[PDB]
């Protein structure tokens, strides 16, 4: 009976999700049929990101916005997300989410006990392999390979 609502933007033909607190932010406005929001209210670093829930765009240009529910039991739902890697080996200051149906892709490989996900099967275009042994996501065929990692996130906002 219940879903959590994670608003998700385009990036570059990926749908990933904003975060909890965006997406909570968002989630209050459409409840209260507004149509201008800006992220920063939630996000101060989100500058001069305007979204419109009318056209369901973001301006910050081109941009697409939607809202997804997704369940209880998925990692937007649990309180947790799994995210890659963003510029050295052992650097951990820019990290990012994969899409929200990847991150429950991956963490469902996880759960099971699979020692590797290759991306480019279950969806995609996403040439990517997830080695769960020692965390990283390789680009095809033969890297970079990227750390990745679980952790745990506030709820999205639940819904009726």
Same mark, same amino acid.
């Given at each position: 009976?219940?879903?959590?609502?994670?608003?998700?933007?385009?990036?570059?033909?990926?749908?990933?999700?904003?975060?909890?607190?965006?997406?909570?932010?968002? @989630?209050?406005?459409?409840? #209260?049929?507004?149509?201008?929001?800006?992220?920063?209210?939630?996000?101060?670093?989100?500058?001069?990101?305007?979204?419109?829930? /009318?056209?369901?765009?973001? @301006?910050?240009?081109?941009?697409?916005?939607?809202?997804?529910?997704?369940?209880?039991?998925?990692?937007?739902?649990?309180?947790?997300?799994? @995210?890659?890697?963003?510029?050295?080996?052992?650097?951990?200051?820019?990290? /990012?989410?994969?899409?929200?149906?990847?991150?429950?892709?991956? @963490?469902?490989?996880?759960?099971?006990?699979?020692?590797?996900?290759?991306?480019?099967?279950?969806?995609?275009?996403?040439?990517?392999?997830?080695?769960?042994?020692?965390?990283?996501?390789?680009?095809?065929?033969?890297?970079?390979?990227?750390?990745?990692?679980?952790?745990?996130?506030?709820?999205?906002?639940?819904? #009726?």
């Amino acid at each position: 009976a219940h879903a959590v609502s994670v608003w998700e933007f385009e990036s570059r033909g990926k749908w990933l999700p904003y975060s909890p607190a965006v997406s909570q932010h968002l @989630e209050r406005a459409h409840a #209260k049929k507004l149509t201008r929001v800006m992220l920063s209210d939630a996000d101060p670093s989100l500058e001069q990101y305007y979204v419109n829930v /009318r056209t369901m765009t973001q @301006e910050s240009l081109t941009i697409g916005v939607r809202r997804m529910f997704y369940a209880p039991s998925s990692p937007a739902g649990k309180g947790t997300k799994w @995210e890659w890697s963003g510029g050295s080996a052992d650097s951990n200051n820019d990290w /990012r989410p994969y899409n929200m149906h990847v991150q429950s892709i991956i @963490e469902d490989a996880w759960a099971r006990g699979e020692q590797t996900l290759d991306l480019s099967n279950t969806h995609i275009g996403l040439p990517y392999t997830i080695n769960f042994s020692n965390l990283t996501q390789l680009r095809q065929p033969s890297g970079p390979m990227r750390s990745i990692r679980r952790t745990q996130q506030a709820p999205y906002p639940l819904v #009726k």
